[PDB]
Design a protein around this nucleic acid. Structure first.
Lengths: 97, 109, 74, 95, 227, 83, 95, 109, 97, 83, 227
DNA sequence: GGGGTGGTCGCTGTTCAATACATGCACAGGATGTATATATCTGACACGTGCCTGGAGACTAGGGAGTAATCCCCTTGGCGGTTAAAACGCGGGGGACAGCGCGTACGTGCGTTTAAGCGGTGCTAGAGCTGTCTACGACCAATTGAGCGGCCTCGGCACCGGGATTCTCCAGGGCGGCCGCGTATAGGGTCCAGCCC
DNA sequence: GGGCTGGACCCTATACGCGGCCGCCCTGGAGAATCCCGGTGCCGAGGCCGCTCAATTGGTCGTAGACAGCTCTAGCACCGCTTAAACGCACGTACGCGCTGTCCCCCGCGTTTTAACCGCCAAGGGGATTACTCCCTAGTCTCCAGGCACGTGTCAGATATATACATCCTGTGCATGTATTGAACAGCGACCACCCC
């Protein structure tokens, strides 16, 4: 019968590989479209430097990673291993956001 | 006739530009006047910080068996140190990644 | 429509013949789902299990008090 | 005609050559180091300006810069930066 | 390949008031990362010079350091009776730290609580605590140094309480193990498979993570005796 | 021309990758929508400031320096883009 | 004679008399309001100075102060402050 | 002879001192030149914010039956408004106290 | 039989009483002793303005109150009612200290 | 002359009162010592900067303005004592 | 002690193109907190003027207002076909908000979703929702207004989602109850013990917590009818 | 007139209604805390006065910013493939969570101790201010070399392919404690011989 | 002459160990991931050359701050007294934590889809620069009035007292359920009236 890793084993390897790696994790073209959409609500027919979009992507991914670390710590504090929106909300509200 | 020019950086024994630092202090609207020793002292401090971070990053790069420093090595050097990390806590380093850190309770067994 | 709890419990145990002991929640669900018992059914179910195991008829294969799993022990 | 830009790349490379003669540095790492130097410059200059304003001094001196260094840099970074700057200022005065 | 430290003058006899000069050679360039230590007998060493020129806190201007690269020197200007002690040069420019052979001189609040002497039988293990106080525990590494009467001082390794990072000397891998406990500000060294050769005084020393900082405060030492 | 539903481009795989880099082992199903909301809020906050700087410059193109200034003003100092 | 030192107390009191004719204000609340005024003044002036530096402009104008107000003040507060400032500037210009 | 003096605050219709604001702008090392309309605009903005906070604090004081505004009323005024709370999120008001607030899970059945 | 309130009723009454008041909760003179003891490790024979010591006390009590709010939120997140040192530690780490 | 152990002056009931103003209903017995450590760290951080400002002014009296500057430099702006 | 709004012209006729003036007299000094609203028939009102002088977002400069203290006025310069509607002044300087009697003039992105028509028997209870979108929900209060053909527009109360704070008109205490849902960004109003007078169209309206702000965006209206 | 059997009475098994027990819920009232109305009084807030310095009026100079014109670069838009990633579906196991139980640690309350708070006095260090004077930082003219832009080459590292090691998963086997069934054992039931009625 | 008692032969109730079974633990082997090693190539890092502008040198000056001296505020030390807060201890309750069961919901893997990425090409918007100009602000001199220091009075709120209402807790009573047990009632063993031979 075919091989299958037990649940929660591949997640560790994914954590290891994405903590070793440094590349951006969100796809560039849909993130760019999202940025343009969001900016459309403040000023029409704006233009963007590729470096400006890259800087936005770097800042957003760093923010999300830093938030998920606190979400994981709150989940562990609840003696859980699954992170939940209650964990995200607790982390964000303690951070003063 | 006048004496051959001698840079203030060489006079202070520094690599960083004392004259450029003095110009930036004057043009930055920090004060009406700027003492002669302020750009020297500041350039020395900036040189010390640059040397510290670059040598730690070079050690990190050597430990990875690569010859040139990259943002990953700068990130590793800064985060592995209490004082540099607390100095640069609110700073994001592009393409620097994160330190490997898995919570103990998540490990098997 | 509910007889004395002794026969209800033994009937519940006899239906789902788990060899390792019938869990409390399984019989509590079953007897109230099949029959119809008053508003305080669950508390009387727990007390019935307690008194039965005190009489020594039922054997607690696992757990403590009422919280475990119980076997008929013939 | 395009104007001349300005950066600390040469000085950072000279410091790198002093601390690690064989080690190189990437362009993006140089950009990050330029950002670091500019940020720390702005922090010390702003804190020294605030110190002068608090003490009503018109001049930013090496004493103001030293106090800013002690306020901003934590732990042993403060002591070693103070030592380096004091050495440089003394050498400059002597020369 | 380990950097050899060479104090050329093994011992001097000198009167009061006169000057003495000690030298310390290096097998490879160490870029000014050399420190000088004064050890009175049955006392923990104290730091005198760091970064090859800088006077440590509380050290009088009588002591002077000089040199760079491979030639280093320690100078004492105005001797007193108290100057009768052994002086060691220590390099930390490369990963395996190496002390000097030691020079004996004869003249005619940061705290690190360390445990008392420990008698031990061969082949078992022993655990030595180093209780630090008076400073931010996580900010400074704890260094461990082994002092035998016949090899002098030997650097074993360090633990960084900030990230529990450790580095060990190749000679002591497996033999030594370092652990930390943030809650009590204590660092523990475990020695495995004790042997009669292991009979020595072990010191724990605080050292900052700054590259020019040296081992500055020392524990009183813990003598381990193997039957 | 008008962009309309691009928040869904922050896919579940992308959020999982971000959580893996964040050290998260097991992920609830509602984290995806919660994270999309949080990311939308953060992006709106940063981009409004970037556009304000661009408008002050009377420029029609948002620059990386404008983004860096917005981040620094929001306490998110970013190294590597001309800061 | 004591050295005269300035504060916003009288102007805060006049604004109070405009918005609530019969209420008063304690000394501690007045000091807190002075601290508030100083803090907001420093914040806006700093943002305007940094805007001028970023745009390589030598002077701080009402446009710079307006952009600083839009950056720091949130939501409806920002647009109401902008409206008040624009009205005051127009009235001043019309003399 | 010089005409009758008229303050810039009165010329703009404001209460806050345009002259004082202008002098603080010039003396604060913000820029080497200062536009004429900038101190007027800034005084208008500061007067707006002061009027808003004072009116909210006066409303709170009136609700508390007190005729004089106190730091408690100021704290209530800022904290009970989301925009003012975001403006002064990193600020501590002396003698201001805290909002009466108890978590639902702590209340008895 | 002597009257007793059940556990937590007096606690709730104290919560209501202290959230309504504004005075300082830490004894002034021993807080001043602590301030002077701490300062003597940075410079000997320092003087202090009474206003400076009061400012220190205000800042300290505000910080502690906010920290206890975050601690209580963490405890509630753990489905507990009692605040614990692990709750304080989580609140601090998430806050960034 | 000297002072040695004034941290114990931050008493158990005082910490309880602070927790009550924080909305805390039930308190573990180790919370008192943990809070004493926290307060000690915070006071050290603030007083160090206040004394640094005092040394810069070449004064021997620490002033409320120095304390306010230290708090503001640490991001804890305090209203009521400045000026 | 409620501040009555007295609009002088109850109705008027005008040809195209000439100026029109409308007056609203305040019972007590409201300190310029007065707004003007245009309501075309069978549609929700739109804001024209706020703070008694300021044009609302998107309102052409043809409309203008003036006055302070107790005498307020509205002006329309270039009359157009669409300008035929009912104009209400609204004061909000004191807690019970009061609309004007209304002036029927005839001539020759923020969304507040609201539920549809309703039939209810007397004595029942009902829950009208108000789905808000296009803006940050917690920053703006939601205002509820009751419109009858006999009493005109009446203010019921408001909910502040930031802290769930409420205020109610004394004429609606108990009758109305306001609740908020931060997750769904939805506001609900409870009407208890429906009675014949409750046959009215109810509007939820957005208003900033800023004192000079006014009801700026309006829901489409819920026509509640009691049998 | 005796042998023998159903009728009927006594003893007892079965079941039932009162006895007793346990749990779960509503309420009266007793104790305590809280909100409200009234009188006292004090010291902080708001007002009035002097004066003095910094803000306003009027005028001049020059340079900073506004505006027009030009270039070219870099942003936007489109098109065609190419996989890599995303979407979707499914089996399952392990984690969330609800309930039960226990013990201990934390709350509540009372009696004892202590030290904070307040007032009053005394003293002197040191913060604040003024005046002198000099060194040092701004400013300008002339110079020149240091730093920046552009061009080029070459080696560090990124990638690709291939072993070699390592880590995970689990199926099978060794090993131990609990349960079912058979056995040596003896207690008693049963057969043979002597004896007393 | 035959059953009772004694001794011996045979039927059977019994305590106990061995085999069967389920669970615990160990380990070897398959397989999938990870890391080391070598070869290739390409493009970015580092070096070289030209130039131009900004950093340096030499000199003048004017004013900012360092120093000295004086003054008088306020911070520190001390002591006594009151009483409120802290502390120590007892008791008990409810909450934290461990254990158990359920079930559903996330993970891992295979299959299908789609759209991001990359290379290539083209248009043109606007960002950057330069030249010209003018008006807007710095700077100066006069002068005067707005605001700050200081004094004073009175009323807003803090305080003390009494009262009236609200909340908490619990002891009691009531309602519903349960298992228990002496007895009300009928079935069978046994004593007696009476039939049959």
């Amino acid at each position: 019968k075919p091989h299958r890793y037990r649940p929660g084993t591949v997640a560790l390897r994914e954590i290891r590989r994405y903590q070793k790696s440094t590349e951006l994790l969100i796809r560039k073209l849909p993130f760019q479209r999202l940025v343009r959409e969001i900016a459309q609500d403040f000023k029409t027919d704006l233009r963007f430097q590729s470096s400006a979009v890259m800087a936005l992507q770097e800042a957003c991914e760093a923010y999300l990673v830093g938030l998920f670390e606190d979400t994981n710590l709150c989940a562990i504090h609840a003696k859980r291993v699954t992170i939940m929106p209650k964990d995200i909300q607790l982390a964000r509200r303690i951070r003063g956001e | 006739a006048r004496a051959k020019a001698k840079t203030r950086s060489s006079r202070a024994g520094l690599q960083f530009p004392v004259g450029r630092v003095h110009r930036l202090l004057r043009k930055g609207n920090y004060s009406e006047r700027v003492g002669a020793g302020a750009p020297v002292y500041l350039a020395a401090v900036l040189e010390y910080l640059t040397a510290e971070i670059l040598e730690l990053a070079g050690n990190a790069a050597r430990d990875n068996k690569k010859t040139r420093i990259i943002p990953r090595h700068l990130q590793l050097a800064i985060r592995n140190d209490e004082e540099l990390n607390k100095l640069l806590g609110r700073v994001t380093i592009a393409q620097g990644g994160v330190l490997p850190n898995i919570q103990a309770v998540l490990l098997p067994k | 429509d509910h007889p004395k709890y002794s026969d209800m419990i033994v009937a519940a145990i006899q239906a789902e013949k788990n060899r390792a002991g019938s869990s409390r929640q399984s019989i509590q669900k079953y007897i109230k789902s099949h029959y119809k018992v008053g508003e305080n059914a669950d508390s009387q179910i727990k007390l019935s299990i307690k008194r039965l195991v005190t009489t020594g008829v039922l054997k607690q294969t696992k757990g403590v008090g009422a919280s475990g799993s119980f076997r008929l022990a013939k | 005609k395009r104007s001349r830009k300005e950066s600390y790349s040469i000085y950072v490379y000279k410091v790198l050559k002093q601390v690690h003669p064989d080690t190189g540095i990437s362009s993006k790492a140089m950009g990050i180091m330029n950002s670091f130097v500019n940020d720390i410059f702005e922090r010390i200059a702003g804190e020294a300006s605030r110190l002068a304003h608090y003490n009503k001094r018109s001049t930013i001196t090496s004493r103001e810069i030293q106090t800013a260094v002690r306020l901003l840099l934590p732990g042993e970074l403060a002591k070693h930066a103070v030592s380096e700057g004091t050495k440089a200022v003394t050498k400059y005065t002597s020369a | 390949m380990d950097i050899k430290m060479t104090q050329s003058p093994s011992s001097m006899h000198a009167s009061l008031g006169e000057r003495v000069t000690i030298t310390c050679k290096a097998s490879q360039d160490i870029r000014s990362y050399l420190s000088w230590y004064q050890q009175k007998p049955w006392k923990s060493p104290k730091t005198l010079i760091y970064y090859a020129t800088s006077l440590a806190d509380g050290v009088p201007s009588r002591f002077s350091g000089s040199g760079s690269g491979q030639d280093f020197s320690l100078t004492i200007n105005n001797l007193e009776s108290d100057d009768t002690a052994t002086y060691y040069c220590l390099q930390h420019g490369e990963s395996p730290y190496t002390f000097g052979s030691g020079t004996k001189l004869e003249i005619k609040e940061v705290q690190l609580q360390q445990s008392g002497p420990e008698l031990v039988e061969p082949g078992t293990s022993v655990k030595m605590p180093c209780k630090a106080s008076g400073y931010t525990f996580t900010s400074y590494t704890i260094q461990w140094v082994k002092q035998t009467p016949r090899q002098g001082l030997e650097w074993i390794g360090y633990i960084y309480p900030y990230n529990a990072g450790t580095k060990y000397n190749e000679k002591f891998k497996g033999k030594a193990t370092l652990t930390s406990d943030k809650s009590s500000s204590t660092v523990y060294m475990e020695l495995s498979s004790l042997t009669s050769e292991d009979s020595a005084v072990y010191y724990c020393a605080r050292k900052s993570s700054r590259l020019r900082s040296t081992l500055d405060y020392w524990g009183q030492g813990t003598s381990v005796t193997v039957s | 021309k008008v962009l309309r539903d691009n928040i869904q481009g922050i896919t579940k795989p992308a959020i999982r990758r971000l959580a893996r880099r964040g050290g998260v082992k097991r992920i609830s199903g509602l984290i995806y929508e919660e994270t999309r909301g949080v990311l939308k809020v953060f992006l709106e906050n940063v981009i409004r400031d970037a556009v304000t700087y661009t408008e002050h410059a009377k420029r029609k193109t948002v620059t990386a320096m404008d983004v860096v200034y917005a981040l620094k003003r929001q306490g998110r100092t970013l190294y590597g883009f001309g800061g």
